[PDB]
Amino acid sequence: QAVALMKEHVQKTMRPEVLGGGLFDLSALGYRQPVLISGTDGVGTKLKLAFLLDRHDTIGIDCVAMCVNDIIVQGAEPLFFLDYIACGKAVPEKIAAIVKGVADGCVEAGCALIGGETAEEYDLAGFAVGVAEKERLITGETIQAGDALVGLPSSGLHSNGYSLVRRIVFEQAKLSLDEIYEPLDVPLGEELLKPTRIYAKLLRSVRERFTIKGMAHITGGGLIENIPRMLPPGIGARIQLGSWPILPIFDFLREKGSLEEEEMFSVFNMGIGLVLAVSPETAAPLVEWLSERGEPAYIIGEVAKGAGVSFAG
């Protein structure tokens, strides 16, 4: 049954270009000068929570999101994904649940799960491949002083800063994953397990109506480390504190862990999972457009001559 359920999950991700191992017929898409963008990633310490809660049908999404979000910031469209599950002994139902999350993420990203491997607690590793029109690569090179930074909200902690989280919730506060602590509105275990947002579909819609000069996926190192990766040399970012909603989970962690402001921004996404750089005149229109489709967005700052990220207000 587990195997049967596993095949059903994979089948949902299929797209017409997949030709029965699965091959991907790129020629069907009609790219003139195709450039392949790939990436690999592991969930990380967040996996430890999956173990403790015996809930494995969502971490697969985090895995897919980490690989896919990094691909789309370069302007690529995700094509296919492959997973690698390592474990002591393989329990069918367990593997089936891990794959289900991967498939769900793949469905959200629009990429097909064309391959997998279960080799004999566990560890998950994902690999995504995307493609972009060579002359349509988003490099951030055209970003100039004065451009606006529009941030799209994260769903929560996403997949970074879990080492610190585990230290705070287990070593320091000695909390229970089943308890509800204010300002959180659900059990801590559930909050810490919320899957990472996948921005693939949204960005594909946005890019059809607007010119995105650059993008940054907020992962390791937070806003501080990732925003500069999309900016040209000589250009820095000025973030306006209080221009976007800092999710409760972060206020919770700051309190329960007696954390300093700088450490926070150096580890957590603080509420923003993807930052977009656009010309000044595009900022408000973009935000309004997203608003009408039920997507919140915030003008979190602007770029300026210099380098690095600084905060104000």
Curated annotation (Swiss-Prot):
Pathway: Purine metabolism; IMP biosynthesis via de novo pathway; 5-amino-1-(5-phospho-D-ribosyl)imidazole from N(2)-formyl-N(1)-(5-phospho-D-ribosyl)glycinamide: step 2/2. Signal peptide: none annotated. This is Phosphoribosylformylglycinamidine cyclo-ligase. It is an enzyme of class 6 (ligase). One of its GO terms (biological process) is adenine biosynthetic process. Belongs to the AIR synthase family. One of its GO terms (cellular component) is cytosol. It catalyses: 2-formamido-N(1)-(5-O-phospho-beta-D-ribosyl)acetamidine + ATP = 5-amino-1-(5-phospho-beta-D-ribosyl)imidazole + ADP + phosphate + H(+). One of its GO terms (molecular function) is phosphoribosylamine-glycine ligase activity. The keyword ATP-binding applies. CDD domains: PurM. Coiled coil: none annotated. Its EC number is 6.3.3.1. NCBIfam families: purM. PANTHER family: TRIFUNCTIONAL PURINE BIOSYNTHETIC PROTEIN ADENOSINE-3, TRIFUNCTIONAL PURINE BIOSYNTHETIC PROTEIN ADENOSINE-3-RELATED. Transmembrane segments: none annotated.
